[PDB]
Amino acid sequence: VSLKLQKRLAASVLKCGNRKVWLDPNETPEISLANSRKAIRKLIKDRLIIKKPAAMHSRARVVERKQAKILGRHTGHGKRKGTKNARTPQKTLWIIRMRVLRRLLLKYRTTGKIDKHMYHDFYLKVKGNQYKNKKALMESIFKALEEKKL
Amino acid sequence: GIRSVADRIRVRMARLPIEGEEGKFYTLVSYVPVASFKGLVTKTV
Amino acid sequence: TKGTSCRGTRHNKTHILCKRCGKRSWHLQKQRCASCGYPDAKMRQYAWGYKALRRRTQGTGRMRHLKIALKR
Amino acid sequence: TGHKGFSYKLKLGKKIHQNRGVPQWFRMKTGNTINYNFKRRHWNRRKMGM
RNA sequence: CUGUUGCUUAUAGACGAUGGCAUCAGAAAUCGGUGUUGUAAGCUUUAGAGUUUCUUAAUCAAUACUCUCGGGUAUUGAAUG
RNA sequence: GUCAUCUAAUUAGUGACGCGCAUGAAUGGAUCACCGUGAUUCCCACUGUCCCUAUCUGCAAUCUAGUGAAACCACAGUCAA
RNA sequence: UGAAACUGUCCUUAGUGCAGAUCUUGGUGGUAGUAGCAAAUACUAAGAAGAGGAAAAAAACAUCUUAGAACUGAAGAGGAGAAAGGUUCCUAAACAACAUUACUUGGAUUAGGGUGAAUCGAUCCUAAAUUACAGAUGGAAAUCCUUAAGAAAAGGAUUGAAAGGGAAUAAGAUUAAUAGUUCUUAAUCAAGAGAAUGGUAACAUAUCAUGAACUUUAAAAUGGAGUGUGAAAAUCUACGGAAGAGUUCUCUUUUCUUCUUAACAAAAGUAAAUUCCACUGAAAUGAAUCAAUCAGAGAAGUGGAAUUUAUUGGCUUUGUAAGAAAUUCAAUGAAUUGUGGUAUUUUUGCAGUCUUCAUAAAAAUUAAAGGGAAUCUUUUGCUCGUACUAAUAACCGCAACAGGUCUCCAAGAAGCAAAAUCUUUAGUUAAAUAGAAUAACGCAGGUAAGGGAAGUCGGCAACAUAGCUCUGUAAGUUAGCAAGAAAGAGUAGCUCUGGUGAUUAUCGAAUCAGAACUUUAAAGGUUAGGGG
RNA sequence: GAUUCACGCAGUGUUAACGUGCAAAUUACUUGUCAUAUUUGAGUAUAGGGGCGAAAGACUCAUCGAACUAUCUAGUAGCUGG
């Protein structure tokens, strides 16, 4: 007897695909008598039909790869396949640095470390690509404050 | 898989009478795992 | 590709059933029946179509009310 | 199609109704030559052009 | 007598054919010989750049040393038994 | 065509000559930078294209079980004069 | 043999005698048990049913269950629709024919069953276009006109879209098959029935707080590119656990699975962006973005108002609502259902920038204004479509044809990449038959000593270069290019170091550079320019 | 109306396969291309001495240097076969 109907009905009740349905092979005459969804549900409750667990997929291998690449283990020249701009976009580095440097000058103006005329002059210097990073701007501001008092 | 099989396999075959008809017979080949095949000759279990 | 391949896109009807003659000859874009000559009041008949005349004409149907009158 | 007109569906239903065979009792009448319906068609054998 | 058939038969072969043996038949493993590749897996040389942690105590560490001329394969169209 | 040049060797290519069978100015004349699955010639590299063929795999082809067409067909099917 | 009509003679009459016409129609041979039944990686074992794996290996055995091994690889051989098909859908009985073997299988035969809507669509509106009465034209059939010609239609007639516009429904369960349609629960919409305050102002008040003719305004209703960013989902990840499963002679406080929530409404807490309002008046010019851009017809500052952000009001939260659902345990009954992220993608908005000799629809329908004419409960919600495929078997190609045919949802690894390659959820293992042998000649994929195009019409075919980083780069030129010119060097594994931020030491981003040591000396498994 | 890759598309070469084919034009690799002179669905408009054509006498339902269909029509043949 073909158990195609029971396999299809069980998959709709178990809410799984036909590949996850397990019909017990030693009671085919018992299973083949269930020609309705009400009868299938009883067979599921009686452990005649069970749902196979999903095949295991481990992320352990990927986790170790990221751990090694954090320490720069595989980030060499021979493992780089894209262009320099592709891996680290140049435009987004400008947007990141502009936000960082313009945030610092906004913090100093409200704190009173620099005045509006000094803040304005450094703003156009920041936009003009004068300081590589935060430290260079802090050094320039520190140096410019000492010329002011002299 | 389908592409590779073990180079040496050790099996155990047993002649037994068929359950349905006792006069007739059938073979039952089973698998006997071994650590190594060294010094293993045809043994009548 | 004028043969087998070009036939795959044929899924749009040109003619559908006509209300007056029952045949699938009603042109959807011309709004007229190729067979019985719809909305035109007179039925479409031609002398070169003598077989077409012997297929649909008087006496090819039930003659529900004319069969009694001529018998009378 | 899924969407169809009302009259078109009834002409589809009649085509279903006419795709039947001769009942057995009709075949046992005296002097009967009608055994099979030669106006039969199947969906995958002939399209009914409607 | 000859043929079929068997050895999933060879010195032969598209198929037939041809060649050999058929109960002292045949086959099979295992063993030794003979070849191929290059030193298995487990534990040990702190081998070991450094890091880390207890702070000489461990760790983790590509690769490297001894067991190891190792391990694996070997008729399938190889040779003995 | 003749002269140079490209090659060991050039009816090929390039550069010159021009009484040009029968070039020639929006039937457009001359000139090409970029571009072209366009036409042509030569170098480097590489290679079974070749000297000159060997060999490997899969699918068939071969044989068998089931199934099973077609083109074609006067009759047919050994040669010399 | 056959079983009911027929024959001879003479005249008369003719659809009167066949080997050919590539003659017409029908039937049948050789070919011939021959060519074939070879694209789409692939099946094996045990059992069940069945006349249908027997046997001197007759080496193969359709269907269903379990196990193993696999393929499509999520721009799929997944889950759903539009056109087209039309009962192909589901179930049972049954296999004569059909699916190039067979079939217990079937999209095949027989017989029943199946398609439920106030909220989804058609119905409604108009777009390109289309067709009427009267009129005009023509010998005629008929053509023209679509608001112009009319005693016709406050104003212009009919049709025209299941992808354009549009009143209103969601979650769970259920069937052999229908489900925003049935059931439970929870809502919504339409049509009904029972002459006001507050705020300086922007503007605000569970109906409120009257508003006719007439007129106006707005919405429906409007291109594309590219950049930044808010939010949700998915993936990834941090902390904290609960429950179950996998591995475990070698280790692994380990690997894996679940930890959810609708329409419609509420308003504890709290965002981003834009535009306006009040105070004050900028120069020593400020403010601001990735880019811009802005300002005395008024900047920045402070305090406010409004709108947008997939339903009320964007996110969390709440009613719904845990009673559902998911994961477990027990033999119907019990357990739990935290909080984050300066990561990626998709979707959805927003903000300004660019671009056009291109400026990227209309109506139905709705609201508001100017004006001043006048003095909570309950009922109903009609007609039609609704099954199924949507394709390496339901569509078009004569067919179960490697051809063609419009869309929606869309995981992990790796990488610049929605690339090649492998896997997860889902689907399938059959998709014109197999077994044995392992000849020639083939089709598809390859390799090769020495030479290196001598082959040939011709380097046809194949080989060869190939990613990224650094250096370097000619003539010529329309000065833009040539240019990835040409040419040269580096690249692996392991252990470390430094740079690039946020909050006041902790937290996070993959990216760049550098140094020792070791080795089989490193883009090349896949993908991947020959040059002059 | 820059250079390329990808989903797709086309059809440069092999003058490969096949050539009583998977197919009355297809398959494989190679090549070109792969968004603004782009690709594409449905609706709608254009008809045979006509239409449509970035122009090949190309396309107009496997039909094109004048479609398909029916009638005139048993068109005519000094030519061919019986």
PDB file of C-alpha atoms in Angstrom, chain A residues 70-150:
ATOM      1  CA  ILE A  70      40.963  39.618  13.815  1.00  0.00           C
ATOM      2  CA  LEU A  71      44.619  39.016  14.694  1.00  0.00           C
ATOM      3  CA  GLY A  72      45.452  39.530  11.011  1.00  0.00           C
ATOM      4  CA  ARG A  73      46.369  35.913  10.329  1.00  0.00           C
ATOM      5  CA  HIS A  74      45.074  35.615   6.753  1.00  0.00           C
ATOM      6  CA  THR A  75      44.967  39.304   5.759  1.00  0.00           C
ATOM      7  CA  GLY A  76      48.130  39.226   3.666  1.00  0.00           C
ATOM      8  CA  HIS A  77      48.873  40.393   0.156  1.00  0.00           C
ATOM      9  CA  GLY A  78      48.213  37.010  -1.436  1.00  0.00           C
ATOM     10  CA  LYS A  79      44.764  36.744   0.155  1.00  0.00           C
ATOM     11  CA  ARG A  80      43.564  40.166  -1.050  1.00  0.00           C
ATOM     12  CA  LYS A  81      41.414  39.900  -4.173  1.00  0.00           C
ATOM     13  CA  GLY A  82      39.721  43.304  -4.434  1.00  0.00           C
ATOM     14  CA  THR A  83      41.133  46.751  -5.026  1.00  0.00           C
ATOM     15  CA  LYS A  84      42.164  48.987  -2.146  1.00  0.00           C
ATOM     16  CA  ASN A  85      39.099  51.205  -2.552  1.00  0.00           C
ATOM     17  CA  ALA A  86      36.813  48.162  -2.720  1.00  0.00           C
ATOM     18  CA  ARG A  87      37.866  46.655   0.616  1.00  0.00           C
ATOM     19  CA  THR A  88      38.073  49.992   2.462  1.00  0.00           C
ATOM     20  CA  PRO A  89      36.093  52.700   0.630  1.00  0.00           C
ATOM     21  CA  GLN A  90      37.988  55.971   0.467  1.00  0.00           C
ATOM     22  CA  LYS A  91      34.893  58.187   0.507  1.00  0.00           C
ATOM     23  CA  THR A  92      33.518  56.652   3.712  1.00  0.00           C
ATOM     24  CA  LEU A  93      36.879  57.237   5.396  1.00  0.00           C
ATOM     25  CA  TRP A  94      36.527  60.934   4.567  1.00  0.00           C
ATOM     26  CA  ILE A  95      32.987  60.982   5.977  1.00  0.00           C
ATOM     27  CA  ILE A  96      34.174  59.230   9.137  1.00  0.00           C
ATOM     28  CA  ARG A  97      37.124  61.590   9.597  1.00  0.00           C
ATOM     29  CA  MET A  98      35.075  64.702   8.821  1.00  0.00           C
ATOM     30  CA  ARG A  99      32.530  63.749  11.469  1.00  0.00           C
ATOM     31  CA  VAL A 100      35.238  62.988  14.037  1.00  0.00           C
ATOM     32  CA  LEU A 101      37.187  66.202  13.457  1.00  0.00           C
ATOM     33  CA  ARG A 102      34.136  68.455  13.166  1.00  0.00           C
ATOM     34  CA  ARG A 103      32.683  66.931  16.338  1.00  0.00           C
ATOM     35  CA  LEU A 104      35.832  67.855  18.263  1.00  0.00           C
ATOM     36  CA  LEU A 105      35.731  71.492  17.154  1.00  0.00           C
ATOM     37  CA  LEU A 106      32.058  71.724  18.101  1.00  0.00           C
ATOM     38  CA  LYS A 107      32.939  70.407  21.562  1.00  0.00           C
ATOM     39  CA  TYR A 108      35.696  72.983  22.049  1.00  0.00           C
ATOM     40  CA  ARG A 109      33.615  75.981  20.960  1.00  0.00           C
ATOM     41  CA  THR A 110      30.854  75.256  23.475  1.00  0.00           C
ATOM     42  CA  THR A 111      33.400  74.489  26.205  1.00  0.00           C
ATOM     43  CA  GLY A 112      35.064  77.865  25.634  1.00  0.00           C
ATOM     44  CA  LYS A 113      38.486  76.490  24.713  1.00  0.00           C
ATOM     45  CA  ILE A 114      38.255  78.317  21.374  1.00  0.00           C
ATOM     46  CA  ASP A 115      36.154  81.284  20.291  1.00  0.00           C
ATOM     47  CA  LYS A 116      34.018  81.700  17.181  1.00  0.00           C
ATOM     48  CA  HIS A 117      36.763  83.363  15.127  1.00  0.00           C
ATOM     49  CA  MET A 118      39.258  80.638  16.022  1.00  0.00           C
ATOM     50  CA  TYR A 119      36.619  77.940  15.517  1.00  0.00           C
ATOM     51  CA  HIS A 120      35.798  79.309  12.066  1.00  0.00           C
ATOM     52  CA  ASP A 121      39.449  79.413  11.001  1.00  0.00           C
ATOM     53  CA  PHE A 122      40.092  75.804  12.038  1.00  0.00           C
ATOM     54  CA  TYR A 123      36.863  74.623  10.398  1.00  0.00           C
ATOM     55  CA  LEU A 124      38.124  75.491   6.918  1.00  0.00           C
ATOM     56  CA  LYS A 125      41.496  73.941   7.769  1.00  0.00           C
ATOM     57  CA  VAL A 126      39.785  70.682   8.738  1.00  0.00           C
ATOM     58  CA  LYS A 127      37.824  70.731   5.476  1.00  0.00           C
ATOM     59  CA  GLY A 128      41.046  71.445   3.586  1.00  0.00           C
ATOM     60  CA  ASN A 129      42.607  68.104   4.605  1.00  0.00           C
ATOM     61  CA  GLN A 130      45.220  69.482   6.983  1.00  0.00           C
ATOM     62  CA  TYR A 131      45.121  66.973   9.864  1.00  0.00           C
ATOM     63  CA  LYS A 132      45.318  63.216   9.374  1.00  0.00           C
ATOM     64  CA  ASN A 133      43.447  62.289  12.548  1.00  0.00           C
ATOM     65  CA  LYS A 134      42.252  63.527  15.930  1.00  0.00           C
ATOM     66  CA  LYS A 135      45.694  63.810  17.534  1.00  0.00           C
ATOM     67  CA  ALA A 136      47.070  66.110  14.831  1.00  0.00           C
ATOM     68  CA  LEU A 137      44.107  68.469  15.224  1.00  0.00           C
ATOM     69  CA  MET A 138      44.444  68.482  19.019  1.00  0.00           C
ATOM     70  CA  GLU A 139      48.141  69.318  18.681  1.00  0.00           C
ATOM     71  CA  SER A 140      47.411  72.169  16.260  1.00  0.00           C
ATOM     72  CA  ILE A 141      44.723  73.586  18.553  1.00  0.00           C
ATOM     73  CA  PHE A 142      47.078  73.335  21.525  1.00  0.00           C
ATOM     74  CA  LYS A 143      49.847  75.105  19.605  1.00  0.00           C
ATOM     75  CA  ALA A 144      47.490  77.808  18.328  1.00  0.00           C
ATOM     76  CA  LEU A 145      46.277  78.628  21.842  1.00  0.00           C
ATOM     77  CA  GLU A 146      49.839  79.403  22.957  1.00  0.00           C
ATOM     78  CA  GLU A 147      50.433  81.816  20.078  1.00  0.00           C
ATOM     79  CA  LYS A 148      47.229  83.599  21.120  1.00  0.00           C
ATOM     80  CA  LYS A 149      48.530  84.381  24.616  1.00  0.00           C
ATOM     81  CA  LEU A 150      51.923  85.571  23.324  1.00  0.00           C
TER      82      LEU A 150
END
